[PDB]
A = this chain, B = another copy of it.
Amino acid sequence: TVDEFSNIRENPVTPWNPEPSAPVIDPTAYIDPQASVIGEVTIGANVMVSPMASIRSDEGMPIFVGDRSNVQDGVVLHALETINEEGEPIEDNIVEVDGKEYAVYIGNNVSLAHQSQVHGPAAVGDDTFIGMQAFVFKSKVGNNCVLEPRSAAIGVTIPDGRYIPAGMVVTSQAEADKLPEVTDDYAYSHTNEAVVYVNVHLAEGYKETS
């Protein structure tokens, strides 16, 4: 028979999750019916979650998405275990953003473009563009950054205001420290602000169809 389900659901009971949690989603955010949002997740105001995105906070938790951010088609957010079966927090898998602990922290005015992925432990600072098919894992991406399409940040801290060229896989802190800077003449210098404006308007337009 037809597959009947809820796409916004609590996470399952496991040895590291005694008490199930359901997503906390601002009334102004739009969650596409063909997106999936599971578990201990906070979604801020004016956020657009597109078809085929999967936000799954059932292993490492919590997963936060700030105000006016977007999670585009096929994007995945997931995280390594943050608390072991013996009730001990796995500090290496927990990110600290302003005195609060997260598995994945997506800041405000952040664009996660189509088919990208941010896997915890990870943090992405405000007004950053994570390009199409890009990857972030075990990293902290600063504010006002640009990850071009197919770039990746693994095990590093990307300083504020830097970009990663298309296709480059950054795996060492020495490499991350030498990334190029966003300047006004850089091709993606204005991309994130335009994308956030478009996506905040799409969230409202789609909300008016539900």
Task: Give A45-82 as 1s and 0s: 1 = Cβ < 8 Å from B's Cβ atoms.
Answer: 00000111010101100000000000011101010010
Asked whether any CB of chain B lies closer than 8 Å to the CB of A115, the reply is: yes
- Docked CA distance A33–B78 (Å): 18
Interface residues of A, count at CB 8 A: 58
Note all chain B residues with C-beta closer than 8 A to A169: 150, 166-167
Could you tell me if A206 and B12 are in contact, using CB atoms closer than 8 angstroms? Answer: yes
Could you tell me if A194 and B6 are in contact, using CB atoms closer than 8 angstroms? Answer: no
Asked whether any CB of chain B lies closer than 8 Å to the CB of A202, the reply is: yes
- Docked CA distance A10–B208 (Å): 12
Q: Nearest-CB distance from A166 to chain B (Å)?
A: 6
Asked whether any CB of chain B lies closer than 8 Å to the CB of A99, the reply is: no
Note all chain B residues with C-beta closer than 8 A to A87: none
Could you tell me if B73 and A54 are in contact, using CB atoms closer than 8 angstroms? Answer: yes
Could you tell me if B150 and A152 are in contact, using CB atoms closer than 8 angstroms? Answer: yes
- Docked CA distance A195–B7 (Å): 24
Q: Besides A14-B202, A133-B133, A137-B149, 12 other CB < 8 A contacts?
A: A2-B5, A3-B5, A3-B33, A12-B205, A14-B205, A32-B36, A36-B73, A56-B73, A74-B74, A74-B76, A119-B132, A152-B167
